[PDB]
Amino acid sequence: SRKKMGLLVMAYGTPYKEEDIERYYTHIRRGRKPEPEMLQDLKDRYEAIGGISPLAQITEQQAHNLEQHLNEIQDEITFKAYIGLKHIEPFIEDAVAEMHKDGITEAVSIVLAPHFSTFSVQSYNKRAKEEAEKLGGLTITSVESWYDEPKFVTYWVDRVKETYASMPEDERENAMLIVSAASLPEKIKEFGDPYPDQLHESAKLIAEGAGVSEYAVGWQSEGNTPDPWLGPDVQDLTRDLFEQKGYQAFVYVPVGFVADHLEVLYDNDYECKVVTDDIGASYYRPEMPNAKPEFIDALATVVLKKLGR
Numbered sequence: 001s002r003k004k005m006g007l008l009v010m011a012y013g014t015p016y017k018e019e020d021i022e023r024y025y026t027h028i029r030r031g032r033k034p035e036p037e038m039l040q041d042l043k044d045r046y047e048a049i050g051g052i053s054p055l056a057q058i059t060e061q062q063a064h065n066l067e068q069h070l071n072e073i074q075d076e077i078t079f080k081a082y083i084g085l086k087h088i089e090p091f092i093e094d095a096v097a098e099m100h101k102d103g104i105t106e107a108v109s110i111v112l113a114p115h116f117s118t119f120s121v122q123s124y125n126k127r128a129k130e131e132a133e134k135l136g137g138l139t140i141t142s143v144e145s146w147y148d149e150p151k152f153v154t155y156w157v158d159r160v161k162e163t164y165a166s167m168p169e170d171e172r173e174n175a176m177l178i179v180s181a182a183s184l185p186e187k188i189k190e191f192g193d194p195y196p197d198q199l200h201e202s203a204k205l206i207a208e209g210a211g212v213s214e215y216a217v218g219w220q221s222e223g224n225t226p227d228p229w230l231g232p233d234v235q236d237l238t239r240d241l242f243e244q245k246g247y248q249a250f251v252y253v254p255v256g257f258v259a260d261h262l263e264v265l266y267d268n269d270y271e272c273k274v275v276t277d278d279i280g281a282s283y284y285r286p287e288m289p290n291a292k293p294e295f296i297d298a299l300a301t302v303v304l305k306k307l308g309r
């Protein structure tokens with residue numbers, strides 16, 4: 001008695017083996033293949049964050065678990081998961097073409113990024129729907145944002161609440177909370193992209209959630225181009241906040257990400273770790289949601305809401 005529905009889970013993507021780095025970054029660099037120095041430098045980073053294999057598995061587990069859960073909490077519909085990656089196969093157009101091949105006519109999409117943006121979120125849905133239209137007989141509902149989902153905000157609030165309830169008295173009373181997210185060219189300003197503000201909102205909600213009045217909103221993992229990108233970067237803000245206030249500790253919350261990917265493992269656990277260690281401050285970084293049930297639940301709910309269920 002259950003209706004059938006595809007579940008299109010979209011993510012940025014991560015290579016599956018040290019051997020896919022090249023092509024993966026060529027796609028990010030938009031056709032320009034990295035140089036033997038940079039590329040070789042990248043391999044080092046992965047080899048440093050423990051490896052590449054674990055990253056891609058985290059996203060595959062998120063879709064399975066979300067599908068499986070969505071089918072336990074409700075019985076009106078039966079979901080079938082389809083991962084749609086942006087920079088590494090299976091690409092969004094491949095997952096879509098597949099569902100159609102499996103006889104699915106209804107679908108709901110949910111990208112693994114809480115905020116909305118004309119560059120990433122809306123782009124992912126765009127390409128999906130067009131693949132769908134080009135084939136027909138297959139429709140797709142798409143979730144734009146979900147950073148404001150109680151269960152999601154709460155997942156971070158409790159993490160951050162524990163992080164502050166571990167620091168010694170002097171830190172806990174002289175700390176700074178930093179909410180980050182992937183940076184994007186400032187050019188998205190011309191289209192009213194609510195991305196900047198959603199980041200400020202998740203910030204305010206989480207800081208407001210843990211009873212922390214001291215906090216900031218930074219960006220990170222910005223690409224390289226001539227035109228300006230969203231600022232200030234967490235590294236510049238973490239050193240700027242210090243030189244003026246002298247915080248004894250900084251707790252980072254990469255709310256823009258949901259798994260342990262180079263963006264959090266390196267750009268945070270290292271590069272920001274490099275700066276706190278430089279200014280003599282303590283470094284905190286609550287664990288990412290990943291495939292933890294509290295998170296899975298959070299998403300399930302988001303999907304159910306989009307369907308009026």
Ligand SMILES: [Fe+2]
Pocket residue numbers: 200217
């Ligand atoms: Fe700001």
Ligand SMILES: [Mg+2]
Pocket residue numbers: 221222267
């Ligand atoms: Mg950087």
